[PDB]
Nucleic acid binder design. Structure first.
Ligand SMILES: [Mn+2]
Ligand SMILES: [Mn+2]
Ligand SMILES: [Mn+2]
Ligand SMILES: [Mn+2]
Ligand SMILES: [Mn+2]
Ligand SMILES: [Mn+2]
Ligand SMILES: [Zn+2]
Ligand SMILES: [Zn+2]
Lengths: 365, 163, 365, 163
DNA sequence: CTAGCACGTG
DNA sequence: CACGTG
DNA sequence: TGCGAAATTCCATGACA
DNA sequence: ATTGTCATGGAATTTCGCA
DNA sequence: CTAGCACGTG
DNA sequence: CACGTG
DNA sequence: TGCGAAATTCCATGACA
DNA sequence: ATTGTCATGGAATTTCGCA
């Protein structure tokens, strides 16, 4: 009926007048430089776009091309994209072409014991009946403790950390959401000591980057030391742990031990510059160092990055999707933006959830 | 002639036997000379082996120039000498029957023995489990002669567990 | 003895005169703004650098800092790097900081059947007792055939490809070095038909990119079509295979079927533009299309990329290194540069080998 | 009135029974109207089921506007009609006892039957295995009326297996 | 090529 | 049965 | 012969391994 | 003794409808 | 968190 | 025993 | 107050997950 | 209801030794 008026030489917003619209074999057609196409009623376009799309569940232009092989109507892509934003199958299966925001480079913890980082390396080749290593990295310094365990138990974590807390108690302990860290047993162990548990966003190990990155130099040293030799790493952990805590970070030009104490212990090639100074005279300088350290800047945002806005429609990457299963949960809403890289959403199981935008994509269309 | 630093000397003795708390009978006392920082290690005997095992833990964290002790068999074994030599630690000994620690340390093991006593009174066989807390106190008690507690001298920061 | 002349006020190339060199406690020292350092003889520097290095098997500056805590001699880093280039443990364990050359964008095969790409998708959730899919992608067009098998056998490959060769015989068949493609049984099957077997460099699936990339759209479609539904993919393969072969590539603005035949079959939304033309008139146009297609250019070389030169010392990534095992074979020599991205080397087992530079790093120092 | 294209009509018959080569007795012959391109499918019987199974293979590669056949039970089943309808293929039939293929096709099945005969002579029960080669020849034999072989008409390129 | 395993919680 | 490639 | 809207193209991103 | 590729959807750009 | 599996060759 | 996180 | 060499710094790359 | 990090080695740059 809307098309009836075209045939009555009447102009309709979107239908260019210069073109000749007419009837042939019970259909309204239009001669285009593309060729002769059909102008279906509005009532059939939703169906037509659906028909074309469901062929290969094709994207925008790939669906448009299909339709444009036969039909023409004003702003087809509008009528296309409207359905793309509603085909649940494509929304949950298609990948994103938006890169996350640029990473945060959080402020390095101010003093030692301000924040620990804890992680488990392993399993490894059984050495002395042990399989895992609980790595504890001090936030500010990078001074690292290495405890061997038989399992990533809550037990082995406490039974190791108690030896460490003996030295000193840390304000915050940071860690992925591994079972031994998320258990009630541990949550409570932390409460006895007035330790605050910080937890990394799930499926995002870079949040425990401090320790994961230390895991490298640990594994990498272990590897060099076991070249052409069986893998008995247990007897080597202390060796590595000392060796690493006293290994310079060229950027800082200090070693983790140095950053923690302000002076070298009786280790080889020990720095003696503060030997003239009194401990006070040398402990002052250490306070300056720890502040006058180097801070990485936030990297440039990718040419086509996306930052999360409250209320915006977004979806969470499916953790372990089965074979031939969509890699995205249904669209969720952004509740709270903790920072340009962290978000509280409303997950698919009707729960509150804090996720890194790395495991999100902005719902397209 | 050169101002004293942490790690410059580590002093040891054993303190035992004590009532068997979970199987541990003695306690290897390590104290830093300059800061007065203290490490305790519950050992089942004051053998060189328990000593080595415990110091093997400590010497993963830090290594001292000198280890100063009395002439206990634990400390004067051939083994223990070979142990210190490999790590470049010097072994100094107090003349027998004549403790030669220092004012800071003298009061420190004083502070430790006084600390340990409270545990024998209060907790007859639960002292083992509380070694960490003791160690915290010892490292968090202030000082007269110096305005600081060890945890401020060893790390240069206020503790998050002060006493 | 070389240092004796310093003490005799004599200048020695590299030892700045302005500094005061002297003896103290049986060692030759030098007052530096760094502090007072020792100048060991040449005879001890190799050992000293080795001593400092082996602490944590530290890199350049990290080793230099250790040494510079005590000693000074002219061009320490020269005496440092000399050993870094010889510590086998570091050479084989340390990662590279050089990105590969920029990728080649090889010429798209000229005509259909000029080159096939073959690959195996799977295993998958057993559908109808089948587990794998042999994907065959035509180089020029992208027209793709999908054959279901129970195993990535040589048998299943031949027994499928015979059905395909029935249609036409291809000049070249390209594929990774999967057992079924590298077997004598297949090599010979290809010889019967005057098919040349091309083989991708090992541990480099992007060389079979044509097909791997098709694997996506295949898996991705399969996924969308099995949403909220058990995974019975067998009955869907043909559906997908048609659906995909007739799905436009927006860049080309043609579909694989189109590129192969020059006209659409009786599929939905079929392009009818050539309906006026004769087959000859339409088959000519198809020859123009196939040539006037789009060709991706080689991307900019990374700011710190490396291209292989003949004779240059290089090492090959260890395929499956065990836990705590070095990820690089010992250094090998570049024999022949097939292209800025492909190399013939002399492998660790004394064999000739053709590898992609992606699995190489230039031996440092 | 509109110039003929490939896929515009697919012609079929069966050619059988033949001597049991590995279990196959009949052969479904598909020929494209315009190019004369030929697909053979060894089936164990000329049922609609074997026909559907075989065309299900073909109609994965291409789908024709019309399928033209004679009035064999295989082609006139209710099933086969429902089969073609779902895919939008039209079914045209030759009047019974009066083949209505076309000159190109007439000679083509001629060329196929003549081709198949050589196999019965030469290879008494190895014809099955050679269906691909036959199919290659059929698709690579040149043409008088047109200067081209099907493999040049269907693909627009010279074959790498010419005859 | 992708399946596993560990742990701690309902 | 181990190794290479996937 | 210029202006606004609409359609096309570009292209970084990610997945196939 | 070989080589990455392409569907995707916002954004950038080119084209179109009308004067 | 990393072990597996498949295949075809000596 | 299944699910989540690693 | 400049020039060449030597030492320092920068920084993209990759691995830890 | 939290956040990437750092050893590495060529190259770029700054500093040093000497006039
Ligand atoms: Mn972990
Ligand atoms: Mn004693
Ligand atoms: Mn493969
Ligand atoms: Mn018949
Ligand atoms: Mn593959
Ligand atoms: Mn981890
Ligand atoms: Zn869809
Ligand atoms: Zn090394």
């Amino acid at each position: 009926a809307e098309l009836d008026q075209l045939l009555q030489g009447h102009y309709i917003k979107g239908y260019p007048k210069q073109y000749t619209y007419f009837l042939e074999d019970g259909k309204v057609k239009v001669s285009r430089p593309e060729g002769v196409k059909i102008i279906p009623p509005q009532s059939d376009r939703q169906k037509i776009v659906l028909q074309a799309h469901n062929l290969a569940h094709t994207g925008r232009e790939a669906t448009l091309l299909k339709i444009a092989n036969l039909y023409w109507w004003p702003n087809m892509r509008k009528d296309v994209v409207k359905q793309l934003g509603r085909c649940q199958q494509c929304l949950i299966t298609n990948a994103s072409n938006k890169a996350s925001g640029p990473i945060l480079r959080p402020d390095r913890p101010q003093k030692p014991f301000d924040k620990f980082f804890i992680d488990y390396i392993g399993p490894l080749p059984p050495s002395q009946g042990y399989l895992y290593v609980l790595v504890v990295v001090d936030g500010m310094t990078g001074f690292t403790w290495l405890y061997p365990t038989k399992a990533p138990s809550t037990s082995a974590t406490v039974k190791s950390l108690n030896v460490l807390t003996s030295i000193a108690i840390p304000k915050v302990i940071h860690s992925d959401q591994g079972a031994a860290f998320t258990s009630s047993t541990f949550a409570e162990w932390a409460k006895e000591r007035g330790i605050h548990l910080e937890f990394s966003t799930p499926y995002h190990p870079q949040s425990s980057g401090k320790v994961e990155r230390k895991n490298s130099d640990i594994k990498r040293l272990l590897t060099k030391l076991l070249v052409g030799r069986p893998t008995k790493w247990y007897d080597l952990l202390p060796v590595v742990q000392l060796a690493l805590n006293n290994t310079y970070s060229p950027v800082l030009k200090y070693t983790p031990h140095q950053l923690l104490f302000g002076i070298d212990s009786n280790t080889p090639f020990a720095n003696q510059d503060t030997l003239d100074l009194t401990r006070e005279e040398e402990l002052s300088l250490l306070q300056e160092i720890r502040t006058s350290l180097y801070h990485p800047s936030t990297p440039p945002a990718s040419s086509r990055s996306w930052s999360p806005v409250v209320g915006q429609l977004v979806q969470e990457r499916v953790a372990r999707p089965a074979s031939l299963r969509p890699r995205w949960h249904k669209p969720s809403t952004v509740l709270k933006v903790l920072n340009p890289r962290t978000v509280v959403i409303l997950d698919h199981l009707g729960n509150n959830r804090t996720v890194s935008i790395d495991n999100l994509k902005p719902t397209s269309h | 002639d050169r101002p004293q630093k942490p790690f410059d000397k580590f002093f040891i003795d054993y303190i035992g036997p004590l009532p068997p708390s979970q199987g541990y009978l003695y306690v290897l006392v390590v104290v830093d000379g300059m800061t007065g920082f203290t490490w305790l290690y519950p050992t089942k005997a004051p053998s060189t082996s328990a000593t080595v095992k415990s110091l093997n833990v400590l010497t993963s964290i830090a290594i001292p120039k000198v280890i100063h002790s009395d002439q206990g068999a634990a400390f004067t074994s051939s083994t223990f000498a070979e142990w210190a030599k490999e790590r470049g630690i010097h072994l100094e000994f107090s003349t027998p029957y004549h403790p030669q620690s220092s004012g800071k340390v003298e009061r420190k093991n004083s502070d430790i023995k006084r600390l340990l006593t409270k545990l024998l009174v209060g907790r007859p066989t639960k002292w083992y489990d509380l070694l960490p807390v003791v160690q915290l106190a010892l490292n968090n008690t202030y000082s007269p002669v110096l305005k600081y507690t060890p945890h401020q001298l060893l790390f240069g920061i206020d503790s998050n567990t002060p006493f």
